[PDB]
Structure 1
């Protein structure tokens, strides 16, 4: 059946308020609409997460504080307590939950929430602009139906909050590809990070250096997810597709285009598992929309016109007004020997995973 697209006017207005990515949610949706892709999906209005829904992961003390400061726990430079942040958080939490529920009822095989992917938040602390971990909330919901969940995080940053939540269990494997460099947030996720306790070997991390491009990135991601699929035999997938890897992002780290990320998405989609799709970082707002629109076409098996259609944010796509993103000339700092070393470490780790 058709992919579920989580959307409502009210939800977009709320997400548009997020101080770090103002109007991004509108840019993404309206570009998707301009390409007419919403006509090929099923539109589902997200529900707002309740206190008890949020507490399936977050502590009651954290949530009540979140609510309080919202009225007027890690809430500093990166997570300042501004007005209404509790409600924005509940909205995005509720949207990802709703996408998880759609997948449970076999309503669809793919459900999309581009405004989710808040991977840094911990049970009792905001972190890295994330005030609530919607991905954790969605994974926990999927656990009602699906015995083993694979979480793949292709954001520029290590998916630490989701990894930490599931660090001690073998029911959820987390796989993050990310920049790993001294001084680079959040600082965790070296290849030696494999989880803890009964969850040992059920976290995978691929530390990557600046300048990686589509070919090498896909080679890495394919080699890893092939071994992971073979060992772990997931029954459902949650996929975080933060677009702060894309050439032209203020993070100025990776040198990806949406085509490379699309090949990673295609590879996952061929498994034909229930797959919950999330956004994440993405700070060149027009490139982020270009990326997730392209990825939405990949999901629908549609090839999109190169020319950006006229729509509300048309002027954001000047001077060239095309959907494709050109790589920068920044050096690729990934030595082939080091990448091979990393992949061999992971190959080894995954031999312990036996279902």
Structure 2
């Protein structure tokens, strides 16, 4: 105990990048290269069963994933009806892949419930876009939702924090009408930017009003600003909501160098957000997500695992399998691009206040 659970397994990693460039392997490989796995408790992930996946997804949709997984993106009549397309490729293995991811996250939640640790990690998870009966944005199964549902079998109030560049709409929609789970997401909100939801006036509905928190941010934000913002909101959510457990997806598609070319963050900035949450001392389920500069994604998460362990890593990338992927420079640190931060300090303030306000109506 008191020692972090690391959901991994050579078979689990093979499955994650078995469709979608091999990224799971690079992440684990860099963590292993830093010997971080020796400081954690490695736990083999179970594979989610239909019942478990049905906790959120409809069987009609789950069955479709099987069908397609077994055959292919062939001219199937119901594929469009279920989100499969360019954004969410129909392929062989799709159902198995989802099931492994869903199980990994459910397994991590189990570890947290069983008191086996205070932090459980699943870097291959965090696919927050999936809907109950529809695929979206590379998410076939919403593992985060399944983890949250699993945690509730033990924790009264769950706080979901999504730091992916994209709005965590799949997760938000799932708990839109409840106050048992609060979703907070910092993301890019601009015309035509996927998924198109998450404006700041998006606060939830019914008993869920004010239990959905969204922070729209513009291109080029850097560590300092981000942390100011994120810490501002979190401090207020912790006071107003009083979570007993935390699910945190840390997609790296916000990091400088990403093909998404939106935010201008470094892993140190995200790591500060992570330390803040860790400080709370609550059961925490860490998830991955976006991140499409593979080498950059692994650099980031390897650094965050270090943060979790409270360990300092060396700037120099250790030699290992995918070593040549680490740049002219082969270092851990990432350098923010020379792009402007179009986040007007005034609007950011209007947002913080608007959120502070809505969090006022929260009383447990």
TM-score by length of 1: 0.99
Once the two structures are superposed, residues 195-232 of structure 1 have per-residue CA deviations (whole angstroms, 9 ceiling, x without a partner) of 01110000000000000000000000000000000000
Once the two structures are TM-superposed, the CA of residue 318 in structure 1 deviates from its matched residue by 2.2
- In the alignment, which of 113, 120, 141 is matched to residue 111 of structure 1? 120
Once the two structures are TM-superposed, the CA of residue 81 in structure 1 deviates from its matched residue by 1.2
Choose 72-81 or 319-328, whichever is displaced more.
72-81
Q: Which residue of structure 2 lines up, in the alignment, with residue 258 of structure 1?
A: 267
Task: For 1:7 and 1:325, locate their aligned partners in 2 and report how far apart those are by CA, in whole Å.
Answer: 26
Once the two structures are TM-superposed, the CA of residue 22 in structure 1 deviates from its matched residue by 1.4
Once the two structures are superposed, residues 163-210 of structure 1 have per-residue CA deviations (whole angstroms, 9 ceiling, x without a partner) of 000000000000000000000000000000000111000000000000
Task: For 1:168 and 1:298, locate their aligned partners in 2 and report how far apart those are by CA, in whole Å.
Answer: 34
Once the two structures are superposed, residues 122-160 of structure 1 have per-residue CA deviations (whole angstroms, 9 ceiling, x without a partner) of 000001110000000000000011000000000000000
Q: Which residue of structure 1 lines up, in the alignment, with residue 75 of structure 2?
A: none
Name the SS of the counterpart of 1:122 in structure 2.
coil
Name the SS of the counterpart of 2:82 in structure 1.
coil
Q: Which residue of structure 2 lines up, in the alignment, with residue 159 of structure 1?
A: 168
Task: For 2:85 and 2:30, locate their aligned partners in 1 and report how far apart those are by CA, in whole Å.
Answer: 33
Q: Which residue of structure 1 lines up, in the alignment, with residue 362 of structure 2?
A: 353
Once the two structures are TM-superposed, the CA of residue 33 in structure 1 deviates from its matched residue by 0.4
Task: For 2:252 and 2:103, locate their aligned partners in 1 and report how far apart those are by CA, in whole Å.
Answer: 22
Task: For 2:36 and 2:95, locate their aligned partners in 1 and report how far apart those are by CA, in whole Å.
Answer: 31
Q: Which residue of structure 2 lines up, in the alignment, with residue 14 of structure 1?
A: 15
Once the two structures are superposed, residues 246-265 of structure 1 have per-residue CA deviations (whole angstroms, 9 ceiling, x without a partner) of 00000000000000000000
Task: For 1:68 and 1:40, locate their aligned partners in 2 and report how far apart those are by CA, in whole Å.
Answer: 41
Unaligned runs of 5+ in 1: none
Residue 147 (structure 2) pairs with residue 138 (structure 1):
yes
Task: For 1:243 and 1:77, locate their aligned partners in 2 and report how far apart those are by CA, in whole Å.
Answer: 21
Once the two structures are superposed, residues 47-86 of structure 1 have per-residue CA deviations (whole angstroms, 9 ceiling, x without a partner) of 0000110000000100001111111911122112101100
Name the SS of the counterpart of 2:183 in structure 1.
strand
Task: For 2:314 and 2:192, locate their aligned partners in 1 and report how far apart those are by CA, in whole Å.
Answer: 40
Once the two structures are superposed, residues 308-332 of structure 1 have per-residue CA deviations (whole angstroms, 9 ceiling, x without a partner) of 0000000000210000000000000
Task: For 2:69 and 2:9, locate their aligned partners in 1 and report how far apart those are by CA, in whole Å.
Answer: 23
Task: For 2:285 and 2:327, locate their aligned partners in 1 and report how far apart those are by CA, in whole Å.
Answer: 32
Once the two structures are superposed, residues 18-40 of structure 1 have per-residue CA deviations (whole angstroms, 9 ceiling, x without a partner) of 4xx31100000010000000000
Task: For 1:81 and 1:30, locate their aligned partners in 2 and report how far apart those are by CA, in whole Å.
Answer: 28
Name the SS of the counterpart of 2:318 in structure 1.
coil
Task: For 1:168 and 1:159, locate their aligned partners in 2 and report how far apart those are by CA, in whole Å.
Answer: 15
Task: For 2:184 and 2:37, locate their aligned partners in 1 and report how far apart those are by CA, in whole Å.
Answer: 30
Residue 291 (structure 2) pairs with residue 292 (structure 1):
no
Once the two structures are superposed, residues 75-113 of structure 1 have per-residue CA deviations (whole angstroms, 9 ceiling, x without a partner) of 122112101100000000000000000000000000000
Alignment of 1:202-213 (within 5 A): 202-213=211-222
Name the SS of the counterpart of 1:351 in structure 2.
helix
Name the SS of the counterpart of 2:215 in structure 1.
strand
Task: For 1:208 and 1:156, locate their aligned partners in 2 and report how far apart those are by CA, in whole Å.
Answer: 9
Q: Runs ≥4 in structure 1, deviation > 2 angstroms?
A: none
Once the two structures are TM-superposed, the CA of residue 17 in structure 1 deviates from its matched residue by 1.7
Once the two structures are superposed, residues 282-328 of structure 1 have per-residue CA deviations (whole angstroms, 9 ceiling, x without a partner) of 00000000000000000000000000000000000021000000000
Task: For 1:207 and 1:273, locate their aligned partners in 2 and report how far apart those are by CA, in whole Å.
Answer: 26
Task: For 1:32 and 1:135, locate their aligned partners in 2 and report how far apart those are by CA, in whole Å.
Answer: 22
Task: For 2:281 and 2:325, locate their aligned partners in 1 and report how far apart those are by CA, in whole Å.
Answer: 35
Name the SS of the counterpart of 2:361 in structure 1.
coil
Task: For 1:62 and 1:243, locate their aligned partners in 2 and report how far apart those are by CA, in whole Å.
Answer: 29
Task: For 2:90 and 2:8, locate their aligned partners in 1 and report how far apart those are by CA, in whole Å.
Answer: 26
Matched length: 353
Question: Cα RMSD between the aligned structures?
Answer: 1.1
